[PDB]
Every structure is written in structure tokens, then in C-alpha cells.
Amino acid sequence: SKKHTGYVGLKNQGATCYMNSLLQTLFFTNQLRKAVYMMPTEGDDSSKSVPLALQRVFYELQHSDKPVGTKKLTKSFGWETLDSFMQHDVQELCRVLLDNVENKMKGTCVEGTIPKLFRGKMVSYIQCKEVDYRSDRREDYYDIQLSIKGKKNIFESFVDYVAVEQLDGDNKYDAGEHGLQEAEKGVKFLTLPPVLHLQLMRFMYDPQTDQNIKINDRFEFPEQLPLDEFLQKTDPKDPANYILHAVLVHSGDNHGGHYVVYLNPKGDGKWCKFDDDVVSRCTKEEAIEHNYGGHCTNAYMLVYIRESKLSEVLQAVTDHDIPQQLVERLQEEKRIEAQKR
Template sequence: MGAACCRKSVAENERLMSEKLKEINEEEKTEVISPTRTSKGYISLVNNFKNPKKEKKAISGIGGFENLGKTCYINAVLQCLCNTNPLADYFLSGLFKEEMCFQNRDNSSAELIYAFAEIIRTQWKANYDCIVPKHFVEIVQKNTQFAQEEEHDVHEFLTFFMGKMNELLNRANTNSSSPVPECNGDTDEHQAAQAWHDHLKSTSSVIVDLFHGQLKSTLKCTQCDQISQNFEPFMSISLPISANKGTSLKQCLKDFTKNESLEQSWFCSKCNKQVTATKSYSIWKVPPILIFQLKRFHFTPEIQEKIKTDIGFPLKSLDLAEYVAGPQKTPPKYDLYAVVNHSGKLTEGHYFTYSKNKNDQRWYKFDDDMVEEMSEDAVESNKAYLLFYYNATPKEFFRQSRTLPQFWPHVLTSEVSPPPIMKRPQTLNISSIVDKQNKRRNSEDIMECLNPPSFSFSGVSAESWAGVDKTGAEGEILFKKLLR
């Protein structure tokens, strides 16, 4: 594909983009698959990476991004996130405006989110050959971490930007309370549930819903066999690479989860001294979107090098079952949809992206403003640095909530009680709901149960919890009054 748009001046491009967006303000060029919504917020985001109906749609979402001076790392991340379809739908539907949290936030963060939303809208609705992300880049470069005219690591920028989105779109109400789900008979399960519950207490956003998972780390004393376990959230997994001639993603995962020896570096409370221990990681909760960083850059005091090992990775049906410790509700099988590649040397390289378009299901190479279709066979290369996978099994990705652990992706073996206001729906006590609302109960308890999706959890169905019709006009009016 050409990039005629980029041959004009930046000012001219911005003017044309602005005019084009005004033209499509009323007329939608790309169908937006709306999240499953209530009167406020959403329950789930549709898993629409595939086009199951094989509909013939106009090809959109394949515009390049102009390089504004060593900004290939920004362009590579933008292409991957624009092609993360549930996230794109979230922004295209305008939900981000409802969930923006301005309390104790700087204006530049909000400006960055709006600039990103404009880029997504331009990419999927204006059908440009090339987009000039000048406003977005200028805001990013206000941060000294990403100063102008310097090379930067794409994973570092991805982590920074996702953190900014998570911060500004955070819907967590730290003043509210909700019970931790009981997991009798399984210490690991209860500890993991407590850790995830605490994580959601401080951070709950579309970034958490789509990208956050949970790792289990285990430390074991080699002298007394005492074990210490910890459960921690993650947004991406960094995988070690051996310097062999060739390896695979599965081998990298095996190396990530194998025991590592820690020489005299862990204090054992039972032995009451520093001891040699082993440390290992396993995945407890898999997120809908799973990002792998292949650690190609090796830094030591003596040497700095780039590892150019060939790494084989599947484009479809990546089975993570043997690397996942916690039982999952759906098979952890993932399909690839985007790759960030790095070419050149460690200190002066270049980033570009391969991504799969949701409309025509074809792969494209995005190298700044240059875009071209490519074959699946060419996706796998020794330049791959970041791999973006999505869980291909579920039809929708549920919102993560402390009050509704039945929507968590991993299985809780014991029955979790429904939120207090939903325990006896057949005899709904309006006065008790009002009392709870006056006591500043978490509004998620009401909001997320207005129209629950079908599910079965520990023998309790959504339908039995929602015996009272809250989706009709009278129910909507009632709950809107309660939420004021």
C-alpha cells in the first residue's frame, strides 16, 4: 500500500484528518460491536478477533503511521493496540468517556487518552493510507522518560502507556467493601483469590479486564523444605531466551517456569538464617489478551548484546495448559494477532509490526507509514520481540469485579455467595436496598447484575440470581433512582 497522505505536510495532514473525522461523525463506516452494557458501564467485551460470519466488509484498520523522528517504537505499539479489537471497540463506543477518572490525575494523562481514542477512530473509520500521530507523540515526549530524538524500548513504552490508561480509566472504589470469596480446602486457591480481590480493590479498568493475569511464585528452602508462596498480577510475561541456534515459545515457557537456584539469598524463617532456595513461577490466572516479551536484549556489566536466536511460535492454538497452575473455566488456548519485531543492532535498531486484520483475516506488515499484505508463513521470524495472543475460546471477556467472582476466568471450587442485594431476588426488599445504598455500598453490586450473561458457577445459575426482571422499563427506572 502507498502512503500518499504522508507526502503532504504535517499541518496539511492534520487538517485533512480533522475534516475527515467531521464527515464521519454522523455516518459510521465501520461496525462497532458494542460491549454488553447496563445503564452504566459494561459487563463484558465481545471477543471479535475473528469474523465468524465471513461478512464482506470494507477493509479498514490498515493505515500506516508517520515516523516523526525515532518514533517507530510508538508506532509499533499503536498498531498492536489498534488491532486489539475489544479495546478498540471500547474506545469507539465511547465507554472510555464514562469511566474517565479525573480525581488526582494530571491533565496530560487525560489528553493522552483522548489522543489515543482519536487515533483509533481515525484508523478504523477514516480509512487513511497514513496517519500522523503528532498530538499523541508530543504528549508522550513531555515525559522525560521518552525524550525526543532518542531510541526507546517498545516494551518499556507499552508498559508506560498501559499504566497511564489503567490509571485514568480506573473505576475501583477503594472505600467500598466486599467479601473475599471463600475457597475451603485449598490454601493456594484461597490465597490467590485474596490476592486478586486485593488487586481489584485498588485497580479495576478495561486494561485489567483484558490484559491482567496472575502469577504464582514459589520459594522453597533446600534445607527444611519450607515453602513460601506469593500471587502477583502481571500485564505481560518476559521470557528468557537461550543462545542456542533455535528454540520455541514453548521451550521459553518451560525455562520461565522451571526451578531457579538462589544461593544464600533467601531468609528462611524456620531455619532462622540465609539459605539456598529454589524459586519457580507458574501462571495462575490467564488474561484474555496475553503479551509475551522475548528477552532478546542481554545486559551485563561486561557485555551488551542482542540475542538473534530463531524462536518458533504458533499462530493458532497455543495450548498453555501445562504452564497454568490454577484451574481455568475455559481451555487456555490462544491465537496470535500481532507481533512487534526489532531489526538492526541493540543500540540503533528499528521496530515494525505484523498484525492480523479482523475484517479480511489477513496479515499485514506495518513499517511506519509503509503497509503491505504478507503471508502467514512470513510472520514467524528471528526478529520477533513482542507477541500478542488472545484467548480464542470464550465469546466474550467479562469485566473483573470483586463483588462478582463468578466472572473471574479461573475456577473457585467452593460456592461463592452472590452479592448481598441479590441473595433473595424473588422477594426483593426495596427498603433494604435503599439502606445499603445509603451506607455507600459498592454500586457495582447493582450495576453489574442488571442484565447478567448466561453462566453456570458452582451450580448457581445467573438466571436464579436474577429472578426479578431488572431489564424492563420499570426495573431500569428503579435502579436509576437508586444510583443517583
């Protein structure tokens, strides 16, 4: 119920798996939401436009007492087949949603919000040992995929991500002028974004079965996340302490299973659980430790917000933050759909 928590649920309208969990995550990323509302969806086709459809879900989630439907959204980005959600990752859906958004906001006041919130920068060095030659290339990322297989916690995942790899023997490095050389290869972070989407590599390939198997191994993540030790140059004025916002959770061993999201919407630490139409209050511990694993129920994705940007990221939202031309068009659609049923 809405009156229980302040928040409404999402309708269950097919095997959308992680979609409802993510939508709620994206919705409670308040700064994104404000920016979605401002998109010039004036001319757009009521069915073929993804940005409108996202504006609709968010509107409804903010205003409706009753659970909110996603069918126009799934039609809008074209994931209407049985195996659509089943064969993709959660981050690939997030990219489909955020790219559509980010492109609509080009030539707009709200330009660049998506990258402002989610784009970090990393380096991918390759260093030869014997003769000197180096390759430093910056890459951008909107999300990170942490390995968990035999890592106790997030600390050990970040250690693994940046750990120096080696290149010798058969699979050596082509240093161009210098021939196929012996060399080290790694990654380091230059910046970590305001909103840190982390995915846990739980659905790993098994060469015996010719299928991905879910790994239910125990994997710990904290409430508070000091990531300063994983940057190339720190900032004393803006250190990289991150707060846990959302724990996207799965139960069972496959796409059928059971997808829930636990969120801390305001960043206070008064958490709620979102199981489609049911939104219940819950403990810090039903959200954090109980999804460590060790049991088929465990976290696959985590959202951390940086303490320095928490208030900005979680800036309050009012009914006055949706433009009235859009508010009108949405209520107009609610009324047209009322005349058919």
C-alpha cells in the same frame, strides 16, 4: 494504502522505534479500542491529556484514508527527547499508555477493562528443603518477558520461566525463624489473561562492551499455543490455547534499525504487514517463520489472544461505537488545524 487492506498506516514522525508497531497492536485489540472511545475526556487539556491523545489516534486510524500522525501523543506522555524511545522497552511504553487509560476509566462503565484484558496472576514460591518452611505470594502481571538465549522455541522459554531454581552456598535464603536455609524458588501461572503480551529478551547486557547487544539467534513461535501445561490447576471448560495475533518485528542490531508489525487483525489468518504509512497484505509465512531469525530481521514481541476470548477481544467495531461529543471535538480540531496551514 487503505483501499488495499481496509487499514491505514501511521506517519513516521521521528525515531519512535516500536511506538507505531504497538499503537497498531493496541488499536486492533478491538475491545480496548471501544473502551478508550468511552472515556470521559470532556474537561481535559487538548495537549497534556494522554487518554484524549490516544482517543485521537484510534479515531483517525479508524476513519482517515491518509496516514495518521502521532505528534500530539508523544507530547502528551513526554517522550520528546532523542534518547526517550531508545533507552526504554516496548512493555514500558505499553504500561505508560495502559495506566493512563485504566485510571481515566475509574468511576466509569468501562472500569477495569485494562485488567480484564491483560492482567494475569502468578505465584512466586520459596520452599526450604531441610527444615519445613514455605512462602507463597501472588503477583500480578500485564506482560511476560521470555528468555531466548539458547532456547529453540516458546515451549523452551515457558519451561525456563517456571523451572525450579536452587539456593545454596553463599547466596542462600533467609527463612526468618529458621536461619539462612537451603531452598528451591520458582514461579507458576494461576491465570493467563485474555490478551497475552509476550516480549522476547533479545537485547541482553554484555559485561565486556558495557552495552546491550541484540541477539539475532533463531527463535520459533507457533501460530497456535497450548499453554495448559504451565498452569497450577487447569480448567477443562476453558483450556489455555492461544492464537497468534501480532508479531512485532525489528531489523538491524540497534534502535535505528527498522520496526515493522505483522498482524492478523480479525483473527481469521488473513495477515497484513504495517510499515508506518504502508500497509500491505502478506503471507502467514512472511509474518511467522520469516521472523524466526537464524538474519538480522526477527520478532521481539508477540501478542497471543486466547481462543475462548477471541471473538469478545476482536468484537467488531462500527463508526457508531465512538460517542458523538468526542467525534465532534475531534472533527473540531481537524477544522481548527485546517485554518492555520
